[PDB]
């Protein structure tokens, strides 16, 4: 109830997913991307407010409104999907 909440008010899930997809890949496909790099958190904030491309296709992703505070929660719970 605290990271999985925030993906919900979090449009995140109008283009990416939990148990499925839709654009982006499901943070539960994302998570096993970043795993062996648990430290990937980082690297993903850079990602999404700037968005990021080539990592999963040429579909780049628009940049988000979101903050350091909510982009690492959500990159704790993503992280901690699976
Ligand atoms: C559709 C406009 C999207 C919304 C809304 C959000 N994301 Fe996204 N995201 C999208 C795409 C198409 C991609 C893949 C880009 C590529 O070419 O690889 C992504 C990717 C991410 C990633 C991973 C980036 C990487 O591995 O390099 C993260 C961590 C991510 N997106 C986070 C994220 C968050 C927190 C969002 C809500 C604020 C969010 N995305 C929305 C497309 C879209």
Request: contains cysteine; negative net charge; hydrophobic residues 40%.
């Amino acid at each position: 109830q605290d990271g999985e909440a925030l993906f919900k008010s979090k449009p995140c899930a109008a283009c990416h997913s939990v148990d499925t997809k839709m654009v982006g890949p499901a943070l539960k496909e994302v998570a096993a991307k970043n795993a062996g790099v648990e430290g990937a958190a980082d690297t993903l904030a850079l990602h999404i407010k700037n968005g990021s491309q080539g990592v999963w296709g040429p579909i780049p992703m628009p940049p988000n409104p979101v903050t350091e505070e909510e982009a690492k929660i959500l990159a704790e719970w993503v992280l901690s999907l699976k």
